[PDB]
Design an enzyme around this catalytic site. Structure first.
Site, PDB file in Angstrom:
ATOM      1  N   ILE A   6       0.808  -1.221   0.000  1.00  0.00           N
ATOM      2  CA  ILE A   6       0.000   0.000   0.000  1.00  0.00           C
ATOM      3  C   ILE A   6       0.855   1.293   0.000  1.00  0.00           C
ATOM      4  O   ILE A   6       0.338   2.377  -0.340  1.00  0.00           O
ATOM      5  CB  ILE A   6      -1.011  -0.050   1.160  1.00  0.00           C
ATOM      6  CG1 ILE A   6      -1.960   1.200   1.195  1.00  0.00           C
ATOM      7  CG2 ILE A   6      -0.279  -0.167   2.498  1.00  0.00           C
ATOM      8  CD1 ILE A   6      -3.260   0.922   2.010  1.00  0.00           C
ATOM      9  N   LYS A   7       2.131   1.190   0.381  1.00  0.00           N
ATOM     10  CA  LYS A   7       3.062   2.321   0.324  1.00  0.00           C
ATOM     11  C   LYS A   7       2.508   3.522   1.112  1.00  0.00           C
ATOM     12  O   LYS A   7       2.653   4.685   0.705  1.00  0.00           O
ATOM     13  CB  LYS A   7       3.392   2.713  -1.145  1.00  0.00           C
ATOM     14  CG  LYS A   7       3.894   1.531  -2.027  1.00  0.00           C
ATOM     15  CD  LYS A   7       2.775   0.594  -2.493  1.00  0.00           C
ATOM     16  CE  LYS A   7       1.717   1.286  -3.350  1.00  0.00           C
ATOM     17  NZ  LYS A   7       0.707   0.301  -3.966  1.00  0.00           N
ATOM     18  N   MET A   8       1.885   3.220   2.251  1.00  0.00           N
ATOM     19  CA  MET A   8       1.082   4.195   2.959  1.00  0.00           C
ATOM     20  C   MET A   8       1.966   5.349   3.477  1.00  0.00           C
ATOM     21  O   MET A   8       3.097   5.152   3.922  1.00  0.00           O
ATOM     22  CB  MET A   8       0.328   3.498   4.102  1.00  0.00           C
ATOM     23  CG  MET A   8       1.110   2.786   5.078  1.00  0.00           C
ATOM     24  SD  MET A   8       0.159   2.985   6.592  1.00  0.00           S
ATOM     25  CE  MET A   8       0.228   4.769   6.553  1.00  0.00           C
TER      26      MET A   8
ATOM     27  N   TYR B 155      -4.012   2.690 -10.182  1.00  0.00           N
ATOM     28  CA  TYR B 155      -4.430   3.831  -9.392  1.00  0.00           C
ATOM     29  C   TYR B 155      -5.129   4.867 -10.298  1.00  0.00           C
ATOM     30  O   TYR B 155      -6.206   5.380  -9.952  1.00  0.00           O
ATOM     31  CB  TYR B 155      -3.207   4.481  -8.771  1.00  0.00           C
ATOM     32  CG  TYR B 155      -2.745   3.846  -7.490  1.00  0.00           C
ATOM     33  CD1 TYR B 155      -1.414   3.456  -7.345  1.00  0.00           C
ATOM     34  CD2 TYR B 155      -3.615   3.666  -6.420  1.00  0.00           C
ATOM     35  CE1 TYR B 155      -0.955   2.870  -6.178  1.00  0.00           C
ATOM     36  CE2 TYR B 155      -3.150   3.058  -5.216  1.00  0.00           C
ATOM     37  CZ  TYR B 155      -1.795   2.712  -5.129  1.00  0.00           C
ATOM     38  OH  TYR B 155      -1.301   2.156  -3.987  1.00  0.00           O
TER      39      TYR B 155
END
Ligand SMILES: O=c1ccn([C@@H]2O[C@H](COP(=O)(O)O)[C@@H](O)[C@H]2O)c(=O)[nH]1
Ligand SMILES: O=c1ccn([C@@H]2O[C@H](COP(=O)(O)O)[C@@H](O)[C@H]2O)c(=O)[nH]1
Lengths: 318, 318
Positions: free
Chosen positions: A135-137, B147
């Protein structure tokens, strides 16, 4: 706690292969086509081989059935998306230390894909296989708490990825719950596989040290301040499989760190060169993620077995 | 195209206030409580004041109704989540240049919250008010395409936020479709509002230039190579409302850039100091995001009117 879970799993499957499950529209449509023609052979296996058999919570009755009719285009798509994912899992789980699901793939269809993602994580939870949400949050603490709820409470993921451009304080809100009583693991982006990754990761520096090193150092400073490791958890690093110099440097600076290394297969990362440079005797500490080279192969099971074999042979050399 | 849309909207509402819509569980539960007690006054307004009235696509029949019964806990929660969002919009739209929805808030409940998010973006699309999804997206190109589909095809957002730690090549896959025929705007994180934001953004450097400057410069180099501006779009910058030195530097280096500046209100950013330092005569080019100071106020409409007034007074000084 994840460190023991990874160690136990490593001894069970004898590999550090991490299967990437990033299904695209063509994957789903293709699987649907071939299942319609072969008379739903892979779904039948999904239904018998899910052991104690798995009961999906989202659309469970329809998934456990005959398939939806073509007139029900949304339901059909959901059915074949879920069963594609279960097929990859069932074809490869004997060879997988972990699965990594990239969040982006589960979004283009709206809430439909999030229900799929829930069923995937729930199935992996049923099988007790280690899980990673890519998710590379990244956000401020207040917002990060909501990512934490989704990732760790809702999906019950074992770990996720995080981008710490904002700073390391964010780790406090993803790696710990509010009460400071539950602890969670994450992998922070350090070096990435894209062609222009050097523009900031290597060209920026502080006091003679390249950015990716400063990022790694600050990350572990924070991991120690959060006491993750005494609570069975860790902050690991994402280091691209094509980042040979960097993976060597990172393993040298942090002998005990956990590395997640995407890039082998579709992106042409040199598995042997990366595994050698990144090597730890505790080999769950280099998770070699392989997505498309397995999920888009003629035979996911054979592809996974092949990587499993290569990694075994390289570990033996080391 | 967004540049004209923002200019037109700016002239209509005479402000650069961007309303943040980040609902938390307490917000939703509280709104539910007060609506049950006042006899659903705010939902009634939502149903009459949505002009040509809006028809939600996700759960439209139930949202346009009497409310769900308390026994249906999930449906009730969805009903009050959607109507909370519509309430904020209807109470504040006269004062808003744009709305920014932070993706994290719409995730902790699984697919339920994504359906809410879809209804929010669809309503804003119905009203034609400029929209921003605060997603901080970052990945390799192949993943970024997914995305893009969610953000721009599914939600039909006007813009999103992005984190370019990986490099600027990622901009090619978020700002342009596959065919190179549709163009989309994004705001790249440059300087953030969290207390430790200096650790990488300012302490890292190249050739005498702080990281946030190198990031901004490289971003605009890429924006020019993508020809966004000739196609009515832009790559903007996120620069925190509490980042006074940096917002001044960014406006100086890129006189024509679009800035999104969160941090006023809950995070105590000095609106007047930031707006002065970041000022552009084309004042849609400093979007002042205010979330909790509006959404958690006793009166969102009054709070929005107050910020609208302050910004007017400060713009007049300038
Ligand atoms: O530097 C990075 C960080 C993350 N990923 C992710 O790892 C996976 C690589 O998959 P594949 O190339 O094996 O299909 C994708 O989910 C991608 O988004 C990378 O490829 N490189
Ligand atoms: O540096 C940044 C980047 C993004 N945000 C986002 O802007 C909003 C600030 O909201 P509030 O503090 O006005 O409630 C939240 O969505 C938060 O995630 C920041 O606050 N600071």
């Amino acid at each position: 706690n994840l460190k023991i879970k990874l160690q136990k799993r490593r001894d069970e499957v004898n590999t550090c292969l991490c299967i990437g499950l990033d299904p695209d529209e063509a994957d789903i449509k293709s699987f649907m086509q071939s299942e319609k023609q072969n008379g739903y052979q892979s779904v039948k296996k999904n239904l018998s081989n899910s052991g104690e058999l798995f009961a999906p919570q989202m659309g469970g009755q329809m998934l456990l059935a005959t398939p939806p009719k073509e007139a029900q285009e949304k339901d059909e798509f959901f059915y074949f998306f879920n069963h594609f994912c279960f097929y990859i899992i069932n074809e490869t789980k004997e060879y997988a230390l972990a699965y990594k699901m990239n969040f982006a793939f589960y979004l283009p269809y709206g809430s439909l894909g999030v229900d799929v993602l829930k069923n995937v994580f729930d199935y992996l939870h049923h099988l007790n296989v280690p899980t990673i949400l890519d998710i590379k949050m990244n956000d401020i603490g207040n917002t990060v708490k909501h990512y934490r709820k989704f990732i760790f409470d809702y999906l019950r993921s074992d770990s996720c990825t995080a981008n710490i451009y904002m700073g390391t304080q964010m780790l406090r809100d993803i790696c710990l719950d509010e009460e400071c009583k539950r602890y969670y693991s994450t992998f922070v982006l350090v070096k990435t596989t894209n062609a222009d990754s050097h523009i900031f990761q290597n060209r920026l520096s502080l006091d003679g040290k390249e950015a990716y090193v400063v990022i790694a150092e600050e990350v572990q400073k924070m991991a120690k301040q959060l006491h993750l490791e005494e609570n069975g958890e860790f902050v690991g690093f994402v280091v691209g499989a094509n980042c040979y110099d960097e993976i060597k440097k990172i393993r040298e600076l942090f002998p005990d760190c956990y590395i997640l290394a995407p890039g082998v297969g579709a992106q042409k990362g040199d598995l042997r060169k990366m595994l050698c440079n990144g090597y730890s005797k505790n080999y769950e500490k280099v998770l070699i993620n392989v997505g498309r080279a397995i999920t888009k192969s003629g035979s996911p099971q054979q592809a996974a077995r092949e990587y499993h074999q290569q990694i075994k042979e390289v570990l033996a050399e080391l």
